[PDB]
Design a protein around this motif. Structure first.
Motif, short mmCIF file in Angstrom:
data_model
loop_
_atom_site.label_atom_id
_atom_site.label_comp_id
_atom_site.label_asym_id
_atom_site.label_seq_id
_atom_site.Cartn_x
_atom_site.Cartn_y
_atom_site.Cartn_z
N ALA A 147 0.82 -1.20 0.00
CA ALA A 147 0.00 0.00 0.00
C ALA A 147 0.86 1.26 0.00
N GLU A 148 2.06 1.18 0.56
CA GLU A 148 2.99 2.30 0.50
C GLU A 148 3.39 2.60 -0.94
N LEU A 205 0.12 6.46 -6.88
CA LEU A 205 -1.07 7.19 -7.28
C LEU A 205 -1.01 8.66 -6.88
N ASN A 206 -0.18 9.01 -5.89
CA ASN A 206 0.08 10.42 -5.64
C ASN A 206 0.68 11.06 -6.88
N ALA A 236 -3.33 3.62 5.95
CA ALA A 236 -2.87 3.65 4.57
C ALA A 236 -3.98 3.28 3.60
N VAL A 266 -1.72 14.05 -13.65
CA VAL A 266 -2.98 14.26 -14.37
C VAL A 266 -3.60 15.57 -13.94
N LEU A 296 -7.65 8.71 -2.23
CA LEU A 296 -6.91 9.45 -3.25
C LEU A 296 -6.87 8.77 -4.61
N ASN A 297 -7.36 7.54 -4.74
CA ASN A 297 -7.21 6.83 -6.01
C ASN A 297 -8.48 6.76 -6.84
N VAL A 324 0.26 4.17 -2.70
CA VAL A 324 0.06 5.60 -2.48
C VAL A 324 1.17 6.40 -3.14
N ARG A 381 -10.44 8.85 -7.96
CA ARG A 381 -10.81 10.11 -8.58
C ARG A 381 -10.07 10.39 -9.88
N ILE A 382 -9.07 9.58 -10.24
CA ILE A 382 -8.31 9.72 -11.48
C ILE A 382 -9.24 9.98 -12.66
N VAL A 409 -5.07 5.63 0.52
CA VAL A 409 -5.03 5.18 -0.86
C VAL A 409 -6.42 5.24 -1.48
N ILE A 454 -1.98 11.12 -9.75
CA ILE A 454 -2.98 12.15 -9.54
C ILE A 454 -2.38 13.52 -9.79
#
Ligand SMILES: Nc1ncnc2c1ncn2[C@@H]1O[C@H](COP(=O)(O)OP(=O)(O)O)[C@@H](O)[C@H]1O
Lengths: 371, 56, 56
Positions: B37-38, B44-45, C37, B51, C44-45, B41, C47-48, C41, B48
């Motif tokens: 998961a690290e 996808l940080n 976490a 984009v 924040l994910n 994130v 919404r792409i 994730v 995001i």
């Protein structure tokens, strides 16, 4: 007065003033020369760019790293690099500044010799000193014991230190580093249809490596996964559009550090050389070393490298010692940071090599304990 | 004639080894997906953000 | 005789139980970081596609 800290390295020169918190100037240590003829008169095109200038003029130059594996091979381009650093990056007369230089362990003696000689003749510094990159990288980590695994762009070495003592008989240098990873990636990127051959586009490949690649915790599982799904493919846009996509390569490339056989080398992987360096030290200090693995250099900046490193060296070590890996988030500059720290000291202000002393004893003074 | 404590404490050690085995095993099993998961994130940080600049 | 090995066995019982405790603590902390976490994730994910279709 102020001291200078110029960490040459391969791939990246990083310089600054002693006592600061980060190197002021950082730029690629390359020297470009035009390879076409040029037709517009009055353009006054200079004959040799250097640094970011060349990195921007890439399209019409031929880039030459003047440091192959920690060693300087083309002294004239290295002198250009130093001159440019001083007179343009820092904009400082080196006449009144003791400078600190770094080099890897187990280098040609003539390397540091000629380095000192040039520093004293051409630039005419007041004093200077040459330090071992790993010792500095340990300084920056606020430690005093622990193997340090510096892996720059040209060379990779382990130095076990305990209580501020170095065990030279266990220093293990290995000539596999970022440049070889870049070349291997250039090679395996062909099998997708992408072909980069120019010294210019080796830099493009380096950028791709710095962005997308990462270390896999388990190579076989990741291979089978990339086979099954496509959740690992990521795209990337070249400097002229034509986006590319790479899949398996993302973790195929940096896996080399653990299986040098990929590039046809015979030596053991990173984890294994580390474990061997441990085992060569006295049994009484092995637990602290197990607990204090330090990592520096830009090549140790792959996502996941610390976790895989820990898993492997845990598998090699006994099950009762505790394995830890000190990977700071700025480790790429730990050598320069440690250099600034050491140069700022005053217990150090009598270890310099005064120009008078060198004039008295010649460049052989370097190897002499005026180190 | 005082071996009862020997037997009991041997079995104590055995069951404690079993418990640490299970515990630490599932422990690293957890941290594997934790660092997974690290990476999730950390990826996808970036995604995001890029984009988002494209949207800007 | 065997009483001294019994002594050492009791001592190792102590320290092994301590290891079990540390193991459970790290387990729980791992699940805590898992929840946190995962919240991040997931938040924040998903919404792409928003930025995607907007720029589209
Ligand atoms: N984020 C990154 N991910 C992977 N590799 C990187 C990253 N940043 C830099 N590198 C590699 O590390 C090298 C820079 O390491 P550096 O410590 O500057 O070497 P040196 O000490 O020889 O100057 C570059 O050649 C590059 O290939």
């Amino acid at each position: 007065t102020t001291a200078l800290v110029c960490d040459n390295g391969s791939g990246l020169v990083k310089a600054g003033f002693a006592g600061d918190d980060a190197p002021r100037a950082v730029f690629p240590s390359i020297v470009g020369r035009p390879r076409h003829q040029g037709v517009m008169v009055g353009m006054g095109q200079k004959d040799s760019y250097v640094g970011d200038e060349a990195q921007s003029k890439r399209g019409i130059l031929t880039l030459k790293y003047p440091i192959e594996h920690g060693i300087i091979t083309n002294w004239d381009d290295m002198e250009k690099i130093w001159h440019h650093t001083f007179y343009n990056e820092l904009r400082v007369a080196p006449e009144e500044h003791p400078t600190l230089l770094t080099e890897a362990p187990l280098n040609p003696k003539a390397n540091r010799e000629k380095m000192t000689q040039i520093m004293f003749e051409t630039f005419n510094v007041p004093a200077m000193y040459v330090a071992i990159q790993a010792v500095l990288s340990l300084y920056a980590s606020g430690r005093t014991t622990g193997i340090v695994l510096d892996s720059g762009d040209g060379v990779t070495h382990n130095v076990p230190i305990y209580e501020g003592y170095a065990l030279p008989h266990a220093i293990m240098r290995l000539d596999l580093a970022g440049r070889d990873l870049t070349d291997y990636l250039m090679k395996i990127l062909t099998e997708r249809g992408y072909s980069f051959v120019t010294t210019a586009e080796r830099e493009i490949v380096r950028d791709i490596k710095e962005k997308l690649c990462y270390v896999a915790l388990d190579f076989e599982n990741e291979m089978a996964t990339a086979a099954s799904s496509s959740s690992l493919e990521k795209s990337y846009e070249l400097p002229d559009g034509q986006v590319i996509t790479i899949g398996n390569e993302r973790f195929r490339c940096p896996e080399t550090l653990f299986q040098p056989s990929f590039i046809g080398m015979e030596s053991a992987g990173i984890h294994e050389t580390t474990y061997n360096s441990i085992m060569k030290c006295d049994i009484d200090i092995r637990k602290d070393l197990y607990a204090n693995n330090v990592m520096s250099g830009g090549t140790t900046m792959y996502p996941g490298i610390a976790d895989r490193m820990q898993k492997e060296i845990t598998a090699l070590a006994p099950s009762t010692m505790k394995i830890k890996i000190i990977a700071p988030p700025e480790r790429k500059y730990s050598v320069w940071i440690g250099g600034s720290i050491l140069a700022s000291l005053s217990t150090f202000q009598q270890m310099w090599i005064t120009k008078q002393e060198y004039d008295e004893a010649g460049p052989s003074i370097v190897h002499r304990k005026c180190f | 004639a005082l071996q009862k404590k020997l037997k009991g404490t041997e079995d104590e050690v055995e069951k404690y080894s079993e418990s640490v085995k299970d515990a630490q095993e599932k422990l690293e099993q957890a941290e594997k997906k934790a660092t997974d998961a690290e990476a999730d994130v950390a990826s996808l940080n970036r995604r995001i953000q890029l984009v988002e600049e494209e949207l800007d």
